[PDB]
């Protein structure tokens, strides 16, 4: 091995909140060496060695007096010497105060390999382990940063204000590299997507179009082809000494009064799958590495927040420190954790400000609202139930378990579950109810690329490939192009028009962003709720039945206060409310009304 | 009415905690009367009239210096005088400190009409509105107090330490009188069961056998044939002016940040059914009436606690005061409320000690554990799921939501749900798992009469009559008799023997009453947990599969600590624990081990 092979992070910033910076340096016999530097405001702490001669950890304290600039770090030993030009960048104006995504935003989610192939020439990159195959469901299809940038106007035009791509960091695996969740280099965009600079450009171009960029980060695991696995930095860098020991996924074990330590350890240290080595975040070097790397991406790429994969599969004490560190840098940031449970208590445990039975504390601002999504999908698919919507109402009534339910991400779907339209039984009328719900709940809405044209999938069990079909129009030669509208069926186009209509309308509705919610218990699968404040009321009413239903309006008078009627935003029609609300089969109305005093 | 028709309560006690006593007096023109008395320690307050000339409410303050004895209350007006000799009883030594049922107890539940007909001559009582019909699923079959008393030896012999009969108070309805839930006289045992004195004797006879008596009380509603309904004490005594307005059962509306007042009012004021007028507990006279009546039954009948029907259908502020009053009189009492929801948060809201988001305070010690019973019934029924027991494990993990989860009542079944054996798919091995679970969880176990001989029912929906078939042996001429054993199948007798074996064993296992619980995440429908303290470990392992399973014991070493083997209490077989635990298809074992250091 030659010179200094990795220096991580490769550069930093003057004026960060946390003064400490730990460089992880990798090169042959770099551990046999002594570091030295001379730069005002930067102090070199003094070595703490690791037994592996191929790694050196350099501890710096960057005082508030340190100015932007650069300086040499010199490594000496064995009659030889190595050097690295270390740069402290100036921070952009307003960096620390950056506004994270919130209730006024709507997030559009893509998988970068499956969205748009702007450059077929990077589909394969010389030296990498996997060849592209657009005909393989688990293969690389060739989507890239160029293709994403090419279609930012489309995304912004649909009414979305944030872009969340699944991970773009290098995944140099022989198979299943496309999905991004098995990182082989946390400091490098996969060259098949483009360069680090292209990713920064993605953020800058999105910002020009009024959109933030949310990065998808994995903290718990890496891919087995990560360069670390060739020469473990420490014997405990990877859980179970770098050997495959599977997790059995007992997620409640970390937050259960009756838990066995075996089960909690198995949850946070167990390997997700054989190809995903599990990081030992109880090693402070590993903790520092991940904290610094994610801060590096936020600062370097101008991100508006993060989506955090496999949330509770990371060590709990590490998560407490990681969330504390990130939010201390960026107090207005948002980060949405993926805690995949349909149990409200299990999700709520992780949100900042929660008083937990075991004293567990967290600075995590947001989580994915799997419970409420599951409830609505059940309601809209189990159409033989008399009152399926009751599950949605009851789930929502548990919002008091969350410190900030308004800051949770509610979603139409994502890359891990059945397509939204398929989950609704390919029933367009019921699908409309899901879309209206998504855009009107007291949540941050997230929508999955392709759902706006009713892409379908299998519904039973688990079939990842089926959820991740290429976006129509993202590849040269596509017969249908959803970006231009060419070749869409009337129903596909109607779906896309409705998404554009609702999302753009939502951007302009403070009452949805921060108004109150009052809902009514569903009766015979009809449901009425209101978003309200002194300036506006929005009344949503859905009839989840293949028959007309009539609802006496006396029931809703604390919200209606004698309103004789209002205009339905969907149809433009005036709807009577004086004595009864008459709903057509399988209908939903979004009635706009004056304020509530 | 002849003079004074009703005086309620009809007598009271010297030396109660609350000094106030409010008498509700009923008779023609009694409202036109003025009350007077002279007895040391007893003060008559200032009259507060109601517009109904047939009722008078008399407020007394019984000072601690009032001795047991009697005094005339004289009612004078319009040139006449009426008298009532009022008695203050001496309280039994230790009355206030009576020990309520708790974790060391096991409750046997009966419906008095359906258990044992000790006296066929009271099946019909002259004057009453319903004739007995043993062949009608919703008719009176003739079970009575004599019958219950006859078989206390049997119930105690099974290992039960508490008897909970569904209500015995008068239900003089034209149809469906048998179930007890529609009271027509809160101060009188239905004459078809026996007299008030017979009910006291049931308590005293149960106590001689080491059993407490738990009364089933309805607070929210009465029956349409209650004598009040002929001449409403006040215009607002009954919600909605004494006219039927149905509840739609929006139970979460009383505990939901997004609730409509329409819904919360509809839950607490709405009539359960047309036949069940709803008590207006916001009227202080109604609140006082119910509180005093339930205290009267406890003090008079020597009860060990209460089971409180339709818990959240009563006014919330009333419930705070009711539970405060009861627990103030009897600080060690237990009362178990029926909040019929499978959602842990909805049930936990009501338990004494809970910190609620809305500041709601309750003094209710216990609730029915519908969530956990539902979880286990799902595990046992969902035979085509790889790991159904996971529901039970995750539900239990939520016990931190309850201030005192060990005080909750866990049940095999009851009069409102499918028979325990039917819920197990009539699979004796799965039934054994449910029984072991019931008897080893950190809960107060309750068992439904008839389940000890594997009585069966329909499985789907609500089918009350199916769950309430006559106890075999309760009627002269029965050809299957569970009391004697005559006509039971080998399997039915084995079930009965197992109930006896486990319930008597449980009585003498303090580790089950107050020990810790450590459970392990179920894997492939196998589940292992331990009850433990410094004195004992009890290991439960179950294999909910029709194939053998082999579980490496390394997993459980934090509890096993090298134990090489143990004896299964159930089969009496030795069970190896050294390296692997071999479980036969559909097996459950219960292994006692010495306490951990
Ligand atoms: O970064 C990894 C991974 O993380 C994110 O999502 C995960 C989440 O954090 C986990 O909590 C969990 O969440 C739920 C899951 O989505 C639900 O499906 C279900 O999980 C169980 C299923 O009910 C059940 O089917 C069970 O049984 C097996 C599957 O049936 C079987 O197909 C196979 O699964 C393998 C996949 O088929 C295969 O494609 C491959 O998956 C990879 C993904 O394609 C890739 O995107 C990434 O996944 C991310 C995910 O995108 C994040 O958002 O890596 C995956 C791993 O290589 O490998 C699968 C094996 O894991 O085998 C399973 C045996 O388990 O599966 C699970 C029980 O484990 O409920 C869960 C919570 O209730 O998983 C998700 C998704 O991985
Ligand atoms: O004191 C009253 C009652 O209280 C206790 O249990 C109740 C609990 O507290 C409530 O929260 C609620 O719980 C849910 C219930 O378990 C679910 O089953 C469901 O209820 C719906 C039914 O599923 C649905 O079928 C329909 O019900 C109709 C019946 O199908 C129909 O036959 C008829 O019902 C008559 C009964 O057949 C008949 O036996 C008699 O019922 C009386 C009970 O036998 C008697 O024990 C008592 O019930 C107690 C219960 O034992 C307590 O432990 O009073 C009953 C009379 O009220 O008479 C019935 C007619 O009067 O009619 C009904 C429609 O009225 O609709 C229901 C409700 O929508 O959801 C409930 C809420 O989530 O109820 C239980 C009682 O089941
Ligand atoms: Ca490409
Ligand atoms: Ca992990
Ligand atoms: Ca009788
Ligand atoms: Ca009521």
UniProtKB/TrEMBL annotation, chains A, B:
InterPro entries cross-referenced by the UniProt entry: Cyc-maltodext_N, Cyclo-malto-dextrinase_C, GH, GH13_cat_dom, Glyco_hydro_b, Ig-like_fold, Ig_E-set
Lineage of the species this protein comes from: Bacteria, Pseudomonadati, Bacteroidota, Flavobacteriia, Flavobacteriales
Enzyme Commission identifier(s): 3.2.1.54
Name of the protein this chain belongs to: Cyclomaltodextrinase
CDD domains from the UniProt entry: AmyAc_bac_CMD_like_3
PANTHER family, A to Z: ALPHA-AMYLASE FAMILY MEMBER (PTHR10357), MALTODEXTRIN GLUCOSIDASE (PTHR10357:SF210)
Residue numbers binding Ca(2+) 1: 117, 119, 122-123, 142, 144
UniProt entry tagged with the keyword Metal-binding: yes
Sites where the protein binds Ca(2+) 3: 278
Top-level taxon: Bacteria
GO biological process, one term: carbohydrate metabolic process
One Pfam family per UniProt: Cyc-maltodext_C
Gene Ontology MF term list: cyclomaltodextrinase activity; metal ion binding
Domain annotation Glycosyl hydrolase family 13 catalytic: ranges: 109-506
Binding, Ca(2+) 2: 220, 268, 278, 313
The keyword Metal-binding belongs to this UniProt entry's keyword annotation: yes
Keywords, comma-separated and alphabetical: Calcium, Glycosidase, Hydrolase, Metal-binding, Signal
SUPFAM superfamilies: (Trans)glycosidases, E set domains, Glycosyl hydrolase domain
């Amino acid at each position: 091995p030659t010179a200094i092979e990795h220096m991580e992070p490769p550069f930093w910033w003057a004026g960060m909140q946390h003064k400490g910076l730990q460089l992880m340096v990798h090169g042959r016999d770099i551990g046999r060496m002594e570091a030295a530097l001379d730069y005002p405001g930067v102090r070199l702490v003094s070595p703490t060695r690791v037994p592996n001669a191929n790694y050196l950890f350099v501890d710096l304290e960057i005082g508030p007096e340190a100015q932007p600039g650069s300086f040499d770090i010199v490594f000496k030993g064995d009659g030889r010497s190595e050097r690295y030009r270390y740069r402290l960048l100036a921070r952009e104006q307003g960096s620390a105060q950056r506004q994270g995504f919130g209730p006024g935003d709507a997030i559009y989610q893509i998988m970068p390999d499956r969205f748009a192939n702007g450059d077929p020439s990077n589909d394969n990159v010389a030296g990498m382990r996997e060849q592209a195959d657009r005909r393989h469901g688990g293969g690389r299809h060739g989507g890239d940063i160029r293709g994403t940038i090419d279609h930012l106007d489309y995304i912004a035009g649909l009414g979305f204000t944030q872009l969340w791509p699944t991970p773009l960091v290098e995944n140099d695996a022989a198979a299943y590299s496309y999905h991004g969740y098995a990182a082989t280099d946390h400091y490098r965009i996969d060259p098949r997507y483009g360069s680090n600079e292209d990713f920064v450009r993605l953020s800058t171009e999105a910002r020009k179009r009024g959109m933030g960029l949310i990065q998808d980060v994995v903290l718990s695991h890496i891919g087995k082809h990560h360069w670390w696995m060739k020469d473990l930095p420490t014997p405990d860098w990877i859980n179970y000494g770098g050997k495959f020991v599977p997790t059995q996924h007992h997620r409640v074990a970390v937050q259960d009064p009756y838990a066995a330590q075996a089960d909690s350890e198995n949850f946070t240290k167990g390997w997700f799958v054989e190809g995903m080595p599990d990081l030992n975040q109880t090693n402070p070097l590993v903790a520092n590495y991940l904290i610094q790397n994610n801060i590096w991406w936020i600062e370097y790429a101008g991100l508006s927040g993060l989506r955090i994969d496999t949330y509770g599969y990371s060590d709990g004490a590490f998560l407490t420190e990681y969330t504390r560190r990130l939010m201390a840098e960026y107090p207005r940031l948002n980060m949405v954790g993926q805690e995949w449970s349909t149990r409200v208590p299990v999700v709520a445990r992780w949100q900042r400000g929660k008083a937990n039975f075991d004293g567990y504390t967290s600075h995590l601002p947001s989580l994915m609202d799997f419970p409420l999504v599951d409830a609505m999908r059940n309601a809209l698919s189990k159409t033989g139930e008399e009152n399926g919507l009751n599950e949605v109402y009851e789930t929502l009534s548990l919002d008091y378990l969350y410190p900030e339910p308004q800051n949770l991400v509610l979603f139409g779907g994502n890359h891990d579950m059945a397509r939204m339209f398929s989950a609704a039984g390919e029933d367009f009328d019921r699908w409309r109810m899901n879309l209206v719900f998504l855009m009107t709940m007291p949540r941050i809405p997230q929508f999955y690329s392709g759902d706006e044209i009713l892409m379908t999938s299998t519904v039973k069990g688990r079939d990842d490939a089926s959820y991740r079909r290429d976006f129509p129009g993202g590849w040269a030669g596509d017969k249908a192009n959803a970006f231009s509208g060419a070749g869409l069926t009337s129903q596909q186009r109607a779906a896309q028009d409705l998404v554009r209509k609702l999302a753009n309308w939502r951007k302009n509705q403070p009452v949805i962003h921060n108004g109150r919610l009052m809902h009514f218990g569903p009766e015979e699968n009809t449901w009425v709720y209101f978003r309200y404040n002194k300036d506006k009321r929005i009344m949503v009413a859905m009839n989840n039945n293949d028959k007309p239903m009539t609802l006496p309006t006396a029931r809703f008078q604390e919200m209606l206060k004698g309103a004789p009627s209002g205009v339905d935003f969907l149809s433009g029609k005036t709807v009577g409310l004086g004595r009864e609300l008459r709903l057509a089969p399988k209908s939903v109305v979004v009635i706009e009304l004056p304020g509530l005093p």
